[PDB]
Amino acid sequence: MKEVCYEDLGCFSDTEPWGGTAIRPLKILPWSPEKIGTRFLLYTNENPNNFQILLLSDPSTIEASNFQMDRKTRFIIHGFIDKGDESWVTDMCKKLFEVEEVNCICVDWKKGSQATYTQAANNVRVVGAQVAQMLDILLTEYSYPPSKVHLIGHSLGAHVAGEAGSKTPGLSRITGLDPVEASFESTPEEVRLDPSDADFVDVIHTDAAPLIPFLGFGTNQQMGHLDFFPNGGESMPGCKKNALSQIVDLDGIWAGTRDFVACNHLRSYKYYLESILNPDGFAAYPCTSYKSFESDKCFPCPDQGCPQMGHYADKFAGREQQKFFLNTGEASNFARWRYGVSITLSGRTATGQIKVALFGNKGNTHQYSIFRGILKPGSTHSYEFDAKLDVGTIDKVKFLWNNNVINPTLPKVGATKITVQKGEEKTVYNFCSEDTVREDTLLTLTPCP
Ligand SMILES: [Ca+2]
Ligand SMILES: [Ca+2]
Ligand SMILES: [Ca+2]
Ligand code: NA
Ligand code: NA
Ligand code: NA
């Protein structure tokens, strides 16, 4: 039925798949560039704290700025912004300056996102068009190719990045940080982020439960070459859950007039932030499901290795669409390292919990529980746990068993053998002992002869 056209951006109609569909019933036209007020704010290593404005209307502003033609460029695009953390975008720039020389462009479209939800969702079309226009200006006027460019889009910004990429042949990367479900999940490739929008698309899922009734803002749909579901993708450690409701006031939530626990939705960028300075902190394991992963079915890493979730995901060698699982901490440091162990019991039959700690040249882990029940000699129990550090080369391990019941005859349990497997290392470590220990007492095992 209807169409609106904007200088240099083309036309936008309120037709399917944009409007009048089951997923997007309302026929909506995007707001004008003038009403959206998109700004391109450049930060560089040399101007890390204060921005330089880049203008679509005046391409020579690029030349005037400290934009470097021999550095890579990352655009960082917001979506939902929580009242108490407006500066994550510029925090991300500063984190990148710690590891690399880069042009950091923060795309501010707040006025465009300050709408009803469904208006904001359509306004994505124009903002994406604008980012694409910037990439064309760089290519044509500055001979600066989109192969040097990475779009990082959070929330609604993920689909803005998607739109930019679809109009930009040769764009090297998009990261979608918890792309939103509402008005995008299950829509055609045109409408949303999808793997064709760049050469490499990686997506982090952190609030992926259905919007109704669970209030998960993110999507569970695979939208990248690599889709990561830390902690299962739906509920993050350290984050409070939203209350279940058959009524969702999207307009209210998006406006900030109605209560919403944004934690899960925000974690996607928090994990990304941390990954920049922890290039091995977020190894992720290919698996069919989180349940399978937690059942110790998807460990260790395949022959070609595990991808890192986050900044170093583009380093990953063995790439159709692949689903990856991992666990993170509940707070900073979020980084974790997964280990798998098998303990072969010795001594006498008892009842309790068996724990192990790993000791290496880089440090040692806390004690992790492996099994709790009847402890019979000769039996093997195996388990996988996510520890807070890479211990390096493991020199020794400590075993302990405990229960919470009085055992009058003071039984002793040991381990004849403990095998340890690190996620990313091919070598298994074997530790041995002839000894047994009293309850709640550390037995040290050294390498097997
Ligand atoms: Ca797309
Ligand atoms: Ca005890
Ligand atoms: Ca006891
Ligand atoms: Na310059
Ligand atoms: Na273009
Ligand atoms: Na959802």
UniProtKB/Swiss-Prot annotation:
Pancreas. It is found in: Secreted. May function as inhibitor of dietary triglyceride digestion. Lacks detectable lipase activity towards triglycerides, diglycerides, phosphatidylcholine, galactolipids or cholesterol esters (in vitro). Belongs to the AB hydrolase superfamily. Lipase family. It comes from Homo sapiens. One of its GO terms (biological process) is fatty acid biosynthetic process. One of its GO terms (cellular component) is extracellular region. Its main location: secreted. InterPro entries: AB_hydrolase_fold (IPR029058), Lipase (IPR013818), Lipase_LIPH (IPR016272), Lipase_N (IPR033906), Lipase_panc (IPR002331), PLAT/LH2_dom (IPR001024), PLAT/LH2_dom_sf (IPR036392), TAG_lipase (IPR000734). GO terms for molecular function: calcium ion binding; lipoprotein lipase activity; phospholipase A1 activity; triacylglycerol lipase activity. The keyword Disulfide bond applies. Residues 337-448 form the PLAT domain. This is Inactive pancreatic lipase-related protein 1. Keywords: Calcium, Disulfide bond, Metal-binding, Secreted, Signal.
